[PDB]
C-alpha cells in the first residue's frame, strides 16, 4: 500500500487528512548504479517535478 | 494499491483528503543502471513534470 | 504500508491527521552506487521536487 | 509500516496527530557507495525537496 | 515501524500527538562509504529538505 | 520501533505527547567511512533539513 | 537483472556456471498481507514446486 | 542485480562458479503481515520448493 | 547486488568460486509482523526448501 | 553488496574462494514482531532449508 | 558489504580465501520482539538450515 | 563491512585467509525482547544451523 486512504462510517471535517512525502530514489532492493564502472561521464539533467498545489 | 481512496457511509467536508507525493525513480527491485559500464556518456535531458495545480 | 490512513467509526475535526516526510534515497537493501569505480565523473543535476502546498 | 495512521472509535479534535520526519539517505542494509574507488569525481547536484506546507 | 500512530476508543484533543525527527543518514548495517578509497574528490551538493510546516 | 505512538481507551488533552529528536548519522553497525583511505578530498555540502514547525 | 548470464570471448568447460536459488515470497516493497485483519481464516494450500533436475 | 554472472576474456574450468542461496521471505521494505490483527487464524500450507539438483 | 559474480581476463580452475548462504527472513526495514495483535493463532506450515545439490 | 565476487586479471586455482553464511532473521531496522501483543499463539512451523551441497 | 570478495592482479592458490559465519538474528536496530506482551504463547519451530558443504 | 576480503597485486598460497565467526544474536542497538512482559510462555525451537564444511 502506497498512500491509500480508507475511511468508514465517519463524520469528516475540513482539511482532515494529509499525507505528503518526497520519496525520490527510495526503496531499492538489489538495484545497482554504476556497479563496475570505469571512465564514465554522468551529466544527466532532470527538471522540476513533484506536487505544486496552490 | 497506489493512491486508492475508499470511503463508505460518511459525511464529507471541504478539502478533506489529500495525498501528495513525489515518487520519481522509486521502488526498484533488481533493476540496474550502467551495471558493467565503461566509457559511457550520459547527458539525457528531462523537462518539467509532475502535478501543477493552481 | 507507506502513508496509509485508516479511520473507522469516528468524528473527525479540522487538520486532524498530518504525515509529512522527506524520504529521498532512503531504505536501501543491497543496492550499490559506484561499487568498483575508477576514474568516473558524476555531475548529474536534479531540480526541485517534493510537495509544495500553499 | 511507514507513516501509517490507524484510528478507530474516537472523537478527534483539531491538529490532533502530526508525524514529521527527514529520513534522507537513512536505513541502509549492505548498501555501498564508492566501495573500491580510485580517482573519482563526485559533483552531483540535488535541488530543494521535501515537504513545504504553508 | 516508522512513525505509525495507533489510537483506539479515545477522546482526542487539540495538538495531541507530535513525533518530529531528523533521521538523515541514520540506521546503517554493513553499509560502507569510500571503503578502499584513493585520490577521490567528493563535492556533491544537496539542497534544503525535510519538513517545513507553518 | 521508531516514533510509534500507541494509545488505547483514554481521554486525551492538548499538546499531550511530544517526541522530538535529532538522529543524524546515528545507529551504525559495521558501517565504515574512509576505512582504507589515502589522499582523498571530502567537501560534500548538505543544506538545511529536519523539522521546522511554526 | 535476475539470473542473467553474460559471457564473451571465452573458452568454457563443463558444469562451469551454476546459480541456484529459492526466492519464494522475497523482495517486497510496501506489500501488506492481512494489514487490518479481524476474525479471518487462512488455510490456503500450495503444492510442490520449484526446480527438480535429475 | 540478482544472481548475474558476467565473464569476459577468460579460460574457464570445471564447476568454476557456484552461487547457491535460500532467500525465502527476505528483503522487505515497509511490508507488513497482520499489522492490526485480532482473532485471526493462520494455517496456510506451503509444500516443498526450491532447487533440487542431482 | 545479490550473488553477482564478475570475472575478467583470468585463467580459472576447478571449483574456483563458491558463495553459499541461508538468508531466510533477513534484511527487513520497517516491516512488522503482528504489530498490534490480540488473540491470534499462527500455525502456518512451510515445507522444505533452499538448494539441494548432489 | 551481498556475496558479490569480483576478480580481475588473475590466475585462479582450485577451491579458491568460499563465502558461506547463515543469515536467517538478520539485519533488521525498525522491524517489530508482536510489538503490542496479548493472548497470542505462535506455532508456525518452518521445515529444512539453506544450502546442502555434496 | 556482506561477504564481498575483491581480488585484482594476483596469482591465486588452492583453498585461498574462506569466510564462514553464523549470523542468525544479528544486527538489529530498533527492532522489538514482544515489546508490550501479556499472556502470549511462543512455540514456533524452525528446522535445520545454514550451509552444509561436504 | 562484514567478511569482505580485498586483495591486490599479490602471490597467494594455500589456505591463506580464514575468517570464521559465530555472531548469533549479536550487535543490537535499541532492540528489546519482552520489554514489558507479564505471564508469557517462550518455548520456540530453533534447529541446527551455521556453516558445516568438511
XYZ file of C-alpha atoms in Angstrom:
648
model
C 0.000 0.000 0.000
C 1.175 3.463 -1.038
C -0.956 6.460 0.040
C -4.214 4.527 0.399
C -6.911 6.252 2.458
C -9.681 4.091 3.918
C -12.494 5.745 5.828
C -15.735 4.155 7.003
C -18.769 5.373 8.991
C -17.428 8.763 9.987
C -18.186 12.471 10.115
C -15.376 14.268 8.327
C -14.255 17.844 8.721
C -12.170 20.300 6.746
C -8.536 19.567 5.769
C -8.859 16.368 7.771
C -6.224 14.006 6.317
C -2.906 14.988 4.727
C -0.124 12.634 3.629
C 2.746 14.489 1.941
C 6.037 12.860 1.016
C 9.161 13.148 -1.114
C 10.186 9.577 -1.971
C 12.594 10.191 -4.846
C 15.043 7.311 -5.458
C 13.855 5.466 -2.349
C 13.147 1.790 -1.598
C 15.778 -0.121 -3.576
C 16.372 -3.875 -3.290
C 19.358 -5.229 -5.201
C 19.381 -2.273 -7.600
C 22.828 -1.105 -8.647
C 24.021 2.103 -10.285
C 27.478 2.054 -11.932
C 28.423 -1.204 -10.204
C 31.587 -1.978 -12.192
C 32.269 1.438 -13.690
C 35.381 2.837 -15.365
C 35.823 6.196 -17.066
C 32.147 7.130 -17.256
C 30.600 10.575 -17.568
C 27.257 11.233 -15.868
C 25.676 14.618 -16.599
C 22.001 13.756 -16.926
C 19.668 16.663 -16.189
C 16.249 16.325 -14.555
C 13.983 19.347 -14.345
C 11.447 20.303 -11.697
C 8.826 17.854 -10.583
C 6.704 16.690 -7.716
C 3.462 18.239 -6.491
C 2.910 22.004 -6.625
C -0.501 22.836 -5.152
C -1.610 26.413 -4.545
C -2.504 -0.168 -4.132
C -1.243 3.249 -5.218
C -3.301 6.312 -4.191
C -6.607 4.465 -3.810
C -9.265 6.287 -1.786
C -12.091 4.218 -0.299
C -14.866 5.966 1.579
C -18.147 4.476 2.770
C -21.155 5.797 4.732
C -19.734 9.166 5.680
C -20.401 12.894 5.750
C -17.544 14.595 3.943
C -16.337 18.147 4.286
C -14.188 20.522 2.280
C -10.570 19.686 1.323
C -10.976 16.525 3.373
C -8.396 14.079 1.961
C -5.052 14.955 0.364
C -2.327 12.519 -0.692
C 0.592 14.277 -2.401
C 3.844 12.554 -3.293
C 6.977 12.734 -5.418
C 7.917 9.125 -6.219
C 10.347 9.638 -9.098
C 12.726 6.690 -9.660
C 11.485 4.922 -6.527
C 10.686 1.275 -5.723
C 13.274 -0.729 -7.665
C 13.776 -4.492 -7.323
C 16.732 -5.946 -9.205
C 16.831 -3.028 -11.647
C 20.309 -1.960 -12.704
C 21.583 1.191 -14.386
C 25.041 1.034 -16.024
C 25.902 -2.220 -14.245
C 29.052 -3.101 -16.213
C 29.820 0.275 -17.759
C 32.969 1.572 -19.448
C 33.497 4.893 -21.198
C 29.845 5.915 -21.412
C 28.384 9.390 -21.779
C 25.053 10.155 -20.097
C 23.559 13.567 -20.882
C 19.864 12.790 -21.206
C 17.601 15.765 -20.518
C 14.171 15.534 -18.888
C 11.980 18.613 -18.729
C 9.462 19.670 -16.102
C 6.780 17.304 -14.957
C 4.623 16.236 -12.079
C 1.418 17.881 -10.885
C 0.958 21.655 -11.076
C -2.434 22.593 -9.624
C -3.456 26.205 -9.074
C 2.488 0.201 4.145
C 3.577 3.705 3.153
C 1.379 6.634 4.280
C -1.832 4.619 4.621
C -4.561 6.250 6.712
C -7.275 4.004 8.149
C -10.120 5.561 10.091
C -13.318 3.879 11.253
C -16.374 4.995 13.268
C -15.110 8.402 14.308
C -15.957 12.088 14.491
C -13.196 13.977 12.721
C -12.160 17.573 13.162
C -10.140 20.106 11.216
C -6.493 19.474 10.218
C -6.733 16.240 12.176
C -4.047 13.962 10.680
C -0.759 15.046 9.094
C 2.074 12.775 7.955
C 4.895 14.722 6.285
C 8.220 13.186 5.327
C 11.328 13.578 3.192
C 12.436 10.045 2.282
C 14.820 10.758 -0.592
C 17.334 7.946 -1.252
C 16.201 6.029 1.834
C 15.583 2.327 2.534
C 18.251 0.507 0.521
C 18.937 -3.235 0.751
C 21.948 -4.489 -1.188
C 21.892 -1.500 -3.543
C 25.308 -0.235 -4.585
C 26.418 3.022 -6.180
C 29.869 3.080 -7.838
C 30.898 -0.180 -6.158
C 34.072 -0.848 -8.167
C 34.668 2.604 -9.617
C 37.740 4.100 -11.281
C 38.097 7.493 -12.936
C 34.399 8.342 -13.102
C 32.769 11.752 -13.361
C 29.417 12.306 -11.641
C 27.755 15.663 -12.319
C 24.099 14.718 -12.647
C 21.699 17.558 -11.862
C 18.294 17.115 -10.223
C 15.958 20.078 -9.963
C 13.409 20.935 -7.294
C 10.850 18.409 -6.208
C 8.766 17.154 -3.351
C 5.493 18.607 -2.095
C 4.850 22.359 -2.173
C 1.426 23.089 -0.677
C 0.234 26.629 -0.016
C 4.983 0.394 8.273
C 5.987 3.936 7.325
C 3.726 6.797 8.496
C 0.563 4.705 8.818
C -2.198 6.243 10.936
C -4.855 3.915 12.350
C -7.730 5.381 14.320
C -10.885 3.609 15.467
C -13.961 4.628 17.502
C -12.775 8.047 18.586
C -13.706 11.710 18.820
C -10.994 13.687 17.068
C -10.041 17.299 17.555
C -8.086 19.905 15.639
C -4.427 19.372 14.624
C -4.587 16.106 16.539
C -1.852 13.912 15.006
C 1.405 15.093 13.428
C 4.288 12.904 12.251
C 7.057 14.938 10.601
C 10.415 13.492 9.614
C 13.509 13.986 7.478
C 14.695 10.491 6.518
C 17.054 11.297 3.648
C 19.632 8.554 2.946
C 18.550 6.570 6.008
C 18.021 2.846 6.660
C 20.727 1.116 4.617
C 21.499 -2.612 4.795
C 24.533 -3.770 2.834
C 24.402 -0.752 0.518
C 27.783 0.605 -0.515
C 28.814 3.909 -2.069
C 32.259 4.069 -3.733
C 33.367 0.812 -2.101
C 36.552 0.244 -4.126
C 37.063 3.729 -5.531
C 40.095 5.318 -7.181
C 40.369 8.739 -8.792
C 36.651 9.504 -8.938
C 34.942 12.879 -9.147
C 31.582 13.332 -7.412
C 29.840 16.658 -8.041
C 26.208 15.632 -8.374
C 23.744 18.405 -7.546
C 20.355 17.861 -5.905
C 17.951 20.765 -5.600
C 15.390 21.527 -2.914
C 12.894 18.928 -1.855
C 10.847 17.587 0.990
C 7.543 18.946 2.273
C 6.814 22.684 2.246
C 3.377 23.314 3.759
C 2.105 26.816 4.470
C 7.503 0.530 12.356
C 8.420 4.111 11.469
C 6.093 6.897 12.694
C 2.982 4.723 12.985
C 0.190 6.159 15.135
C -2.407 3.744 16.514
C -5.312 5.105 18.513
C -8.422 3.240 19.635
C -11.515 4.149 21.694
C -10.409 7.577 22.834
C -11.427 11.213 23.134
C -8.767 13.282 21.411
C -7.900 16.908 21.960
C -6.011 19.593 20.085
C -2.343 19.164 19.055
C -2.421 15.863 20.913
C 0.362 13.762 19.337
C 3.587 15.048 17.773
C 6.518 12.950 16.554
C 9.234 15.077 14.933
C 12.624 13.729 13.916
C 15.699 14.334 11.783
C 16.966 10.885 10.759
C 19.300 11.797 7.901
C 21.940 9.129 7.145
C 20.913 7.068 10.174
C 20.475 3.320 10.762
C 23.216 1.692 8.685
C 24.078 -2.019 8.797
C 27.134 -3.070 6.809
C 26.925 -0.017 4.546
C 30.272 1.439 3.532
C 31.219 4.793 2.034
C 34.656 5.064 0.366
C 35.845 1.806 1.939
C 39.037 1.351 -0.101
C 39.462 4.869 -1.447
C 42.452 6.559 -3.075
C 42.640 10.014 -4.626
C 38.905 10.692 -4.752
C 37.116 14.028 -4.899
C 33.749 14.370 -3.151
C 31.928 17.664 -3.719
C 28.320 16.558 -4.062
C 25.792 19.256 -3.181
C 22.421 18.603 -1.544
C 19.949 21.443 -1.183
C 17.377 22.097 1.521
C 14.945 19.421 2.538
C 12.938 17.983 5.363
C 9.606 19.240 6.675
C 8.787 22.959 6.715
C 5.340 23.480 8.245
C 3.986 26.938 9.019
C 10.003 0.715 16.504
C 10.830 4.326 15.651
C 8.437 7.041 16.909
C 5.382 4.788 17.184
C 2.558 6.131 19.354
C 0.025 3.639 20.712
C -2.908 4.907 22.731
C -5.968 2.953 23.840
C -9.080 3.764 25.913
C -8.056 7.208 27.087
C -9.163 10.813 27.425
C -6.559 12.966 25.720
C -5.780 16.606 26.304
C -3.963 19.356 24.453
C -0.287 19.029 23.411
C -0.279 15.709 25.235
C 2.551 13.693 23.634
C 5.740 15.074 22.076
C 8.719 13.062 20.830
C 11.378 15.272 19.227
C 14.799 14.020 18.190
C 17.853 14.723 16.058
C 19.204 11.317 14.996
C 21.507 12.317 12.142
C 24.211 9.722 11.354
C 23.243 7.604 14.364
C 22.898 3.842 14.915
C 25.675 2.303 12.816
C 26.629 -1.387 12.888
C 29.707 -2.341 10.884
C 29.417 0.730 8.653
C 32.724 2.278 7.647
C 33.585 5.670 6.182
C 37.010 6.043 4.510
C 38.283 2.800 6.048
C 41.481 2.444 3.997
C 41.816 5.986 2.688
C 44.759 7.767 1.070
C 44.858 11.241 -0.446
C 41.107 11.827 -0.557
C 39.236 15.119 -0.666
C 35.866 15.359 1.092
C 33.962 18.613 0.560
C 30.381 17.421 0.213
C 27.790 20.046 1.126
C 24.439 19.293 2.763
C 21.898 22.067 3.156
C 19.316 22.630 5.872
C 16.954 19.884 6.867
C 14.988 18.367 9.681
C 11.629 19.528 11.012
C 10.718 23.224 11.091
C 7.263 23.645 12.633
C 5.826 27.059 13.445
C 18.608 -8.313 -13.644
C 17.523 -11.736 -12.396
C 19.712 -14.741 -13.322
C 21.244 -13.178 -16.435
C 24.427 -14.842 -17.692
C 26.714 -12.814 -19.959
C 29.807 -14.445 -21.392
C 32.098 -13.080 -24.093
C 35.313 -14.300 -25.772
C 35.972 -17.289 -23.556
C 36.789 -20.986 -23.516
C 34.156 -22.709 -21.414
C 34.388 -26.008 -19.608
C 31.967 -28.495 -18.112
C 29.449 -27.508 -15.394
C 31.058 -24.079 -15.437
C 28.378 -21.698 -14.100
C 25.619 -22.530 -11.611
C 23.197 -20.081 -9.997
C 20.634 -21.835 -7.789
C 18.218 -20.004 -5.519
C 14.990 -20.272 -3.548
C 13.418 -16.799 -3.624
C 9.863 -17.596 -2.539
C 7.966 -14.589 -1.118
C 11.078 -12.402 -1.237
C 11.684 -8.763 -2.223
C 8.583 -6.911 -1.024
C 8.200 -3.120 -1.050
C 5.062 -1.760 0.593
C 3.202 -5.052 0.159
C 0.894 -5.960 3.023
C -0.763 -9.232 3.994
C -3.737 -9.048 6.400
C -2.926 -5.455 7.368
C -6.152 -4.656 9.243
C -7.442 -8.169 9.853
C -10.144 -9.448 12.200
C -11.520 -12.968 12.501
C -10.009 -14.353 9.303
C -9.272 -17.961 8.412
C -6.239 -18.717 6.237
C -5.868 -22.342 5.133
C -4.663 -21.992 1.558
C -2.699 -24.992 0.295
C 0.206 -24.795 -2.152
C 1.678 -27.986 -3.550
C 5.243 -28.778 -4.558
C 7.125 -26.509 -6.886
C 10.493 -25.142 -7.816
C 13.147 -26.838 -9.934
C 13.647 -30.610 -9.806
C 16.524 -31.584 -12.101
C 17.909 -35.113 -12.201
C 21.278 -7.477 -9.700
C 20.253 -10.937 -8.504
C 22.499 -13.888 -9.470
C 24.002 -12.253 -12.560
C 27.217 -13.840 -13.838
C 29.466 -11.737 -16.074
C 32.590 -13.291 -17.529
C 34.856 -11.845 -20.208
C 38.094 -12.981 -21.903
C 38.806 -15.989 -19.729
C 39.691 -19.671 -19.742
C 37.089 -21.473 -17.667
C 37.380 -24.793 -15.908
C 35.004 -27.345 -14.450
C 32.467 -26.444 -11.721
C 34.015 -22.986 -11.713
C 31.290 -20.673 -10.344
C 28.547 -21.592 -7.868
C 26.079 -19.210 -6.221
C 23.547 -21.045 -4.041
C 21.098 -19.291 -1.745
C 17.875 -19.646 0.219
C 16.239 -16.201 0.193
C 12.699 -17.079 1.263
C 10.746 -14.128 2.726
C 13.818 -11.883 2.641
C 14.357 -8.220 1.708
C 11.222 -6.443 2.931
C 10.771 -2.659 2.961
C 7.607 -1.381 4.621
C 5.809 -4.701 4.139
C 3.516 -5.692 6.986
C 1.919 -9.006 7.909
C -1.059 -8.912 10.316
C -0.315 -5.321 11.337
C -3.555 -4.607 13.221
C -4.781 -8.152 13.779
C -7.461 -9.513 16.105
C -8.773 -13.062 16.354
C -7.235 -14.374 13.138
C -6.431 -17.954 12.194
C -3.383 -18.623 10.011
C -2.947 -22.224 8.855
C -1.747 -21.800 5.286
C 0.272 -24.745 3.982
C 3.174 -24.459 1.539
C 4.705 -27.602 0.096
C 8.285 -28.314 -0.922
C 10.125 -25.977 -3.213
C 13.468 -24.535 -4.122
C 16.154 -26.151 -6.263
C 16.723 -29.916 -6.189
C 19.618 -30.803 -8.497
C 21.068 -34.305 -8.647
C 23.911 -6.669 -5.740
C 22.974 -10.169 -4.590
C 25.286 -13.051 -5.606
C 26.739 -11.337 -8.677
C 29.986 -12.827 -9.989
C 32.175 -10.640 -12.203
C 35.330 -12.097 -13.691
C 37.551 -10.559 -16.357
C 40.808 -11.593 -18.078
C 41.601 -14.614 -15.950
C 42.573 -18.273 -16.019
C 40.023 -20.166 -13.960
C 40.402 -23.502 -12.251
C 38.093 -26.131 -10.821
C 35.545 -25.330 -8.070
C 37.009 -21.836 -8.018
C 34.236 -19.610 -6.607
C 31.525 -20.629 -4.135
C 29.006 -18.331 -2.445
C 26.527 -20.256 -0.284
C 24.045 -18.595 2.046
C 20.840 -19.056 4.016
C 19.121 -15.650 4.044
C 15.607 -16.630 5.114
C 13.590 -13.747 6.626
C 16.606 -11.428 6.562
C 17.054 -7.740 5.681
C 13.882 -6.057 6.939
C 13.339 -2.285 7.023
C 10.153 -1.108 8.713
C 8.432 -4.462 8.190
C 6.175 -5.548 11.032
C 4.661 -8.913 11.912
C 1.691 -8.926 14.331
C 2.353 -5.331 15.399
C -0.897 -4.722 17.305
C -2.034 -8.303 17.816
C -4.672 -9.761 20.132
C -5.897 -13.345 20.335
C -4.340 -14.572 17.095
C -3.456 -18.118 16.098
C -0.400 -18.683 13.895
C 0.118 -22.256 12.686
C 1.296 -21.753 9.120
C 3.378 -24.629 7.766
C 6.264 -24.239 5.318
C 7.865 -27.324 3.825
C 11.457 -27.935 2.785
C 13.232 -25.522 0.520
C 16.535 -23.986 -0.379
C 19.251 -25.508 -2.553
C 19.911 -29.257 -2.534
C 22.818 -30.042 -4.864
C 24.350 -33.506 -5.069
C 26.531 -5.842 -1.757
C 25.679 -9.380 -0.661
C 28.050 -12.193 -1.732
C 29.455 -10.396 -4.778
C 32.730 -11.790 -6.125
C 34.862 -9.518 -8.308
C 38.043 -10.880 -9.830
C 40.220 -9.248 -12.477
C 43.494 -10.179 -14.225
C 44.361 -13.216 -12.149
C 45.416 -16.851 -12.282
C 42.916 -18.834 -10.247
C 43.375 -22.189 -8.594
C 41.132 -24.893 -7.200
C 38.576 -24.194 -4.429
C 39.960 -20.670 -4.323
C 37.142 -18.530 -2.868
C 34.463 -19.651 -0.405
C 31.900 -17.438 1.330
C 29.472 -19.454 3.468
C 26.961 -17.888 5.831
C 23.773 -18.452 7.803
C 21.978 -15.088 7.892
C 18.491 -16.164 8.957
C 16.415 -13.353 10.523
C 19.379 -10.965 10.487
C 19.740 -7.254 9.665
C 16.534 -5.664 10.961
C 15.908 -1.907 11.110
C 12.700 -0.830 12.828
C 11.055 -4.213 12.255
C 8.832 -5.397 15.085
C 7.397 -8.808 15.914
C 4.437 -8.928 18.341
C 5.021 -5.338 19.467
C 1.765 -4.834 21.391
C 0.710 -8.447 21.847
C -1.886 -10.002 24.147
C -3.029 -13.615 24.295
C -1.456 -14.754 21.031
C -0.495 -18.262 19.972
C 2.565 -18.722 17.751
C 3.159 -22.262 16.482
C 4.312 -21.674 12.921
C 6.455 -24.480 11.514
C 9.323 -23.984 9.064
C 10.987 -27.008 7.515
C 14.588 -27.520 6.455
C 16.301 -25.031 4.224
C 19.566 -23.407 3.341
C 22.307 -24.830 1.134
C 23.052 -28.564 1.088
C 25.968 -29.245 -1.262
C 27.577 -32.669 -1.529
C 29.133 -5.018 2.194
C 28.371 -8.592 3.241
C 30.808 -11.328 2.124
C 32.156 -9.455 -0.901
C 35.460 -10.750 -2.279
C 37.528 -8.395 -4.436
C 40.737 -9.656 -5.987
C 42.864 -7.935 -8.617
C 46.153 -8.761 -10.389
C 47.102 -11.804 -8.360
C 48.246 -15.409 -8.546
C 45.802 -17.482 -6.532
C 46.349 -20.848 -4.929
C 44.177 -23.625 -3.567
C 41.614 -23.030 -0.777
C 42.913 -19.472 -0.626
C 40.049 -17.424 0.868
C 37.406 -18.645 3.324
C 34.795 -16.521 5.098
C 32.425 -18.626 7.215
C 29.884 -17.155 9.609
C 26.719 -17.826 11.582
C 24.843 -14.509 11.725
C 21.386 -15.684 12.785
C 19.247 -12.947 14.397
C 22.151 -10.488 14.386
C 22.418 -6.757 13.615
C 19.180 -5.265 14.945
C 18.461 -1.528 15.149
C 15.235 -0.553 16.892
C 13.670 -3.969 16.276
C 11.487 -5.245 19.095
C 10.139 -8.703 19.881
C 7.192 -8.929 22.315
C 7.692 -5.341 23.491
C 4.431 -4.946 25.432
C 3.467 -8.590 25.840
C 0.918 -10.241 28.126
C -0.136 -13.883 28.226
C 1.452 -14.936 24.941
C 2.496 -18.404 23.829
C 5.558 -18.757 21.592
C 6.236 -22.263 20.271
C 7.361 -21.596 16.714
C 9.567 -24.329 15.261
C 12.413 -23.729 12.809
C 14.146 -26.688 11.214
C 17.755 -27.097 10.133
C 19.398 -24.535 7.934
C 22.619 -22.818 7.063
C 25.387 -24.143 4.828
C 26.223 -27.857 4.726
C 29.146 -28.432 2.357
C 30.837 -31.811 2.036
C 31.742 -4.235 6.127
C 31.065 -7.840 7.123
C 33.561 -10.503 5.957
C 34.857 -8.554 2.956
C 38.185 -9.751 1.552
C 40.192 -7.317 -0.575
C 43.424 -8.480 -2.153
C 45.503 -6.670 -4.764
C 48.805 -7.394 -6.556
C 49.830 -10.445 -4.575
C 51.056 -14.019 -4.820
C 48.667 -16.178 -2.830
C 49.296 -19.553 -1.280
C 47.192 -22.401 0.046
C 44.625 -21.907 2.850
C 45.842 -18.324 3.052
C 42.935 -16.364 4.585
C 40.329 -17.683 7.029
C 37.675 -15.647 8.842
C 35.361 -17.837 10.933
C 32.795 -16.462 13.355
C 29.651 -17.235 15.326
C 27.699 -13.964 15.524
C 24.274 -15.235 16.576
C 22.077 -12.574 18.235
C 24.924 -10.047 18.253
C 25.102 -6.301 17.539
C 21.834 -4.904 18.899
C 21.031 -1.186 19.161
C 17.789 -0.314 20.928
C 16.301 -3.754 20.264
C 14.157 -5.124 23.070
C 12.892 -8.624 23.807
C 9.957 -8.954 26.245
C 10.377 -5.374 27.474
C 7.114 -5.083 29.429
C 6.235 -8.754 29.784
C 3.731 -10.498 32.051
C 2.762 -14.163 32.099
C 4.365 -15.131 28.795
C 5.484 -18.557 27.628
C 8.547 -18.805 25.378
C 9.301 -22.273 24.002
C 10.401 -21.528 20.452
C 12.664 -24.186 18.952
C 15.489 -23.484 16.503
C 17.284 -26.378 14.858
C 20.898 -26.688 13.762
C 22.475 -24.055 11.596
C 25.654 -22.252 10.743
C 28.444 -23.479 8.481
C 29.366 -27.170 8.322
C 32.293 -27.642 5.936
C 34.063 -30.977 5.559
